[PDB]
Symmetry: C2
Subunit: 407 residues, 2 copies
């Protein structure tokens, strides 16, 4: 590590003695130049406070599992599915069955053994090739309902170096995929098929082009308000600040064709550590649905954490529609399934998150707790039912089955 | 155990959404507007500003971080951490709470007596506003070439009621009597370049009009100038709401604080809602000048804003953080040795699995990216390592932080 020794910036205040590092910043461009500048005029998300739960989709079983050093065994997968069901999740990603025999086997097992509750819709991932799309539908044979999630990469970079293809050609991959899904659904009546499309690497894709591909896919699928389509907009790489994600989401929500037949879905990764914020801002921008994992498992920096998002609603008086009353049981099961720890400082579930080491903070917390008890008596009430008013502790640890520890 | 929510759906909930009401006691918690106040900011500008320079960084690892540890830093571990922060490029370094902690007092004496403080570094000390605590704080720093004395008192609606059982005027007088005492003490210790920092502690639970009033009053006592500014540090003591509302509050303060060109507006965002990084970046775009955090987000409970993520979030979009992160492994080894707590596998930039790809499709795309770069390098008689980084799925060249891509 070499102490930066370059000169200060032109106009750097004299009280800031920081120096230029020799890091190769020239290999990297501001988001506006790497992709495009902000399309969004008259944004409204900064003025909208979340007042309801989104539709949650848990991707722990596929998008999560794919990220593991030690892949989930059949037993760990069933434990994860069971946990997700008991928590209250209604859409659950279960595999990439056309590319993974173990995914394929798991899908068959839950279908054939009657593991799927009537209000749960399994989700399967597929790429656009016709034979992979056929294998996806076959895996799901006998399912009473399923979401077939088809996708292809739309970014400026991937169009150039991966596909070596223009805009029309890349759009045709997606529309040809949708046409195949329509053909296959007709071949398999009696499963209620639902569709989800992602312009993968959406955050690296020009918005007008993202809207174009989605609109075209929608034309083929012909969704209706009663049989909507999911357009899921992934931050495949989280590329800039979460305000710009949210602006993009609002622009899409405002401008996509047939909007009232669209479930607008978010899938934010954490490359810049701001996945939760992108999700929360993006939800205020008009999204309908969020794809994440318990404790934010997923490749590299991971998926948006469903626990942090859920309890961020609860702690501001909004029902997440999910049972978080035993976070310890959630946490044990997750660590068992993923064979990877929940960090000590992880919001709501980490080892240290209901501890106070500071003496002043310990004093203040006791004042807060003693004053609540005093009020409980002066109202003839159970303190446990009263408005939580304790300095330093955003929630009563007992509402998630945890305990405050003065250390 | 865990039981499937079975309460009714919300009024208006679409029939495609089968979710039901849980028995979580949401009635015990109020929206932020009701718990504190609604947003004061009109015509916000932060949503339209992209960061184009590094903030003044302040590293609080040695006190605010150390306070969070299961196993307190020994003198050797503290020196190691201080050495890292210096070598990385940090110019303001919190070193202790010497009036509350004899082992802090000992560390502050050690660095001053032994001449450990680099010539471009200002040590930061924390104190509460009791006069005898303030006196002991200046005595701790006796001999220092320069120092920030950071005094604070809690200003939140909640703490006024249940902690201080006091009104607005009275809580403001705590802060101003604190300021007066610091002015008296600095006149008693010539030679040391004394600087001040004031925090309305629990600012996010405090009404903005009242946070401005207290800061303004403190400012009146200290009498800062553009040549001798004051730091007003605005902590999200508890992160209470979304990062846009924190940023709106910073912008409102930066607009409205008296004597703004003699103020260094500093951020201290915690991670209760998992949005500390966002709160810091949006808040910097709102007009802040300075950010207080720790390497790898160490700090009580969910911790402090991560300095590494904030720094690398600047580098990866073409802005020099003015900090050296060329060997992130070295930083991480030292952090884990000093804190005796791990960097998570998925921690941005530094975690074990951040330069890994398991997906077969991503692996293919990564190879295509890397192959096309080399053909462009060779095309232009350039070194591939000096060229614009263009690899699907990998925001930065792992080698720019001394790491390696691994296809697994
Ligand atoms: Ni993902
Ligand atoms: Ni802190």
């Amino acid at each position: 590590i070499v102490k930066p020794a370059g000169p200060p910036r032109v106009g750097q205040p004299s009280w800031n003695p920081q120096r230029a590092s020799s890091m190769p910043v020239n290999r990297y461009r501001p988001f506006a130049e790497e992709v495009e500048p902000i399309r969004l005029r008259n944004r409204t998300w900064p003025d909208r406070v979340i007042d309801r739960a989104p539709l949650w989709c848990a991707v722990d079983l596929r998008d999560g599992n794919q990220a593991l050093i030690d892949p989930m065994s059949p037993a760990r997968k069933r434990r994860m599915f069971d946990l997700l069901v008991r928590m209250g999740y209604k859409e659950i990603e279960v595999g990439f069955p056309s590319a993974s025999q173990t995914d394929f086997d798991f899908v068959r097992e839950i279908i054939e053994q009657g593991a799927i509750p009537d209000d749960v819709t399994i989700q399967v991932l597929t790429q656009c090739r016709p034979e992979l799309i056929e294998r996806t539908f076959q895996a799901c044979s006998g399912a009473p309902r399923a979401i077939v999630h088809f996708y292809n990469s739309t970014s400026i970079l991937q169009r150039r170096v991966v596909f070596r293809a223009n805009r029309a050609e890349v759009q045709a991959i997606a529309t040809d995929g949708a046409r195949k899904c329509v053909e296959q659904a007709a071949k398999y009546p009696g499963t209620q098929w639902r569709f989800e499309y992602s312009p993968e690497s959406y955050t690296g894709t020009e918005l007008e082009y993202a809207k174009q591909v989605c609109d075209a896919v929608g034309e083929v699928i012909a969704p209706t308000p009663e049989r909507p389509i999911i357009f899921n907009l992934p931050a495949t790489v989280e590329m800039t600040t979460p305000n710009v994600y949210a602006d993009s989401i609002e622009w899409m929500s405002r401008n996509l064709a047939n909007r009232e037949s669209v479930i607008l879905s978010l899938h934010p990764h954490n490359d810049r550590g701001t996945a939760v914020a992108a999700a929360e801002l993006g939800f205020a921008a008009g999204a309908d649905r969020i794809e994440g994992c318990l404790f934010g498992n997923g490749e590299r920096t991971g998926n948006v954490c469903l626990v942090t998002l859920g309890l961020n609603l609860f702690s501001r008086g909004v029902d997440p529609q999910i049972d978080f009353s035993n976070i310890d049981e959630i946490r044990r099961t997750v660590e068992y399934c993923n064979q990877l720890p929940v960090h000590e400082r992880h919001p709501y579930g980490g080892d240290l998150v209901y501890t106070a080491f500071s003496g002043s903070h310990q004093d203040a917390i006791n004042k807060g707790l003693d004053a609540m008890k005093l009020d409980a008596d002066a109202a003839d009430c159970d303190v446990d039912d009263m408005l939580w008013q304790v300095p330093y502790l955003p929630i009563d640890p007992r509402d998630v089955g945890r305990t405050y520890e003065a250390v």
